[PDB]
Prior knowledge:
Elements: H1 37-45, H2 93-107, H3 167-184, H4 197-200
Family: Belongs to the TPX2 family.
Subcellular location: Nucleus; Cytoplasm, Cytoskeleton, Spindle; Cytoplasm, Cytoskeleton, Spindle pole
Subunit structure: Associates with microtubules. Interacts with aurka and plk1. Interacts with kif15.
Amino acid sequence: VPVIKATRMPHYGVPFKPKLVEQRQVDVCPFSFCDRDKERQLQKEKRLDELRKDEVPKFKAQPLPQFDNIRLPEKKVKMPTQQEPFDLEIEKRGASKLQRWQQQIQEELKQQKEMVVFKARPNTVVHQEPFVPKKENRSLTESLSGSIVQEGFELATAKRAKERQEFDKCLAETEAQKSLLEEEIRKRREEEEKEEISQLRQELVHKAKPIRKYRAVEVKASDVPLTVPRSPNFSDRFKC
């Protein structure tokens, strides 16, 4: 079944892709934060803190950490990922490709910027990708709580000033609802065109190795562009 409820261990090197992340439905997919971060733990946790560069998000992206979140040790990629563009969290490849990473995990979301920002300070680990509270969304204090200094959905420092009255206290949690869901799901409620944008419009997101990322045929997925698995140490494409 396409369910997260993933075991803790290296993200890209934890159960990868049964198919879809936990639900595959904005109504029964918590990346909400009334009190459902607890299941969501899995997604948030893995790359953030210690791997504090640019959150490879709490995946509302492709399935439970399949390729996403921390780094991939050479002794953990015992089993291969199923279907993905990149499994570039990969110490070789990936972490190097990590600059290129920014395009796919970002671009499926309209907003994008220098992610090897939003984790280099106190709670700036809540960009519209890692977005949840608790110890991280302490607000947007005074000197260095990490306002999202980068923009989070809106929630960068200075991008408080005009917005503050309707913004923070009232809209910020509802802001959070549109946030994370908007990223990779990119749907909100209607318009499936918003989804499958990662491949289709311009986003020559990863020119890596030709990926039949051409999900326009086995559109039966989720949050991930139906991408053929990236090849590891085989020159021949993983297809054959």
